Each structure stands twice: as structure tokens, then as C-alpha cells.
Design a binder for this molecule. Structure first.
Ligand code: CL
Ligand code: NA
Ligand code: NA
Length: 129
């Protein structure tokens, strides 16, 4: 599924991401835009052999099991394919564990490089939330 911007903002809010660990909703929408272009089916392979999955590009070396990342942890205890669903619940629940692990949203490279320090509220402007 490819979300609209406000559609995704509304889904993220319903799932408790607004101000989760202090990160306003616009931060999450901005991260999703640049990680996946709002596409739940996005995948990208990394140089170390791990793969990133879904709207928030969650990595198989630490967070989910894709059966082909040796020595990987499965800290969200989910198959990585569950992160590609049109229902974002599994991605959101895993993202909550990631953002609580110490480094906050800096875990998402695109957030650090393209959202951090910008006016992220623009990502939810105009939306009926
Ligand atoms: Cl980047
Ligand atoms: Na893909
Ligand atoms: Na992989």
C-alpha cells in the first residue's frame, strides 16, 4: 500500500506515535517519506547482507527475522515480511521498541539526515487529525 501523507499521519496517530518518546507526529511522517516514500512494500538490501523492510525500513540484522541474515537478532520477534503489510501495526510496534533503545530516532539514517532540525510540522499541515 502507498499511503497518502495525511492518511499515514492519521494511522500513526491512532497507533500512538504522536509524541511517542517525545517525537512529534511530523517526525514520524517525515521519516516514512524519506525511508520508503510511504510504500509499505519497500525493501532495500544493505552491504552487510541485511535487508530493510517496510514503511520505516526496519533492519533484519537486529529487529526482524527474514531467514537470510546470519547471526541476526530478532528483537521485535516478528518475521520481516510482517512489516510489509498494508496494516502498519507491526511496523509501529517495532518502531516503538527501536526508538526506546537509547539513540532515539537517530536510528533512522534518513530521519537524521533529512528530517532532524527541519520544520517537521509541515508534514502534517492541512491534515484532519
Ligand atoms: Cl540519508
Ligand atoms: Na520491495
Ligand atoms: Na537480508
Amino acid at each position: 500500500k502507498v499511503f497518502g501523507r495525511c492518511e499515514l499521519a492519521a494511522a500513526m496517530k491512532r497507533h500512538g506515535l504522536d509524541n511517542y518518546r517525545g517525537y512529534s507526529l511530523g517526525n514520524w511522517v517525515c521519516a516514512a517519506k524519506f525511508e520508503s516514500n510511504f510504500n509499505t512494500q519497500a525493501t532495500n538490501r544493505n552491504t552487510d547482507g541485511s535487508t530493510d523492510y517496510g514503511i520505516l525500513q526496519i533492519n533484519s540484522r537486529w529487529w526482524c527475522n527474514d531467514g537470510r541474515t546470519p547471526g541476526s537478532r530478532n528483537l521485535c520477534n516478528i518475521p520481516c515480511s510482517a512489516l510489509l503489510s498494508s496494516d502498519i501495526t507491526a511496523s509501529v510496534n517495532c518502531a516503538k521498541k527501536i526508538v526506546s533503545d537509547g539513540n532515539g530516532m537517530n536510528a533512522w539514517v534518513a530521519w537524521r539526515n533529512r528530517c532532524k532540525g527541519t520544520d517537521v510540522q509541515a508534514w502534517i499541515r492541512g491534515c484532519r487529525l
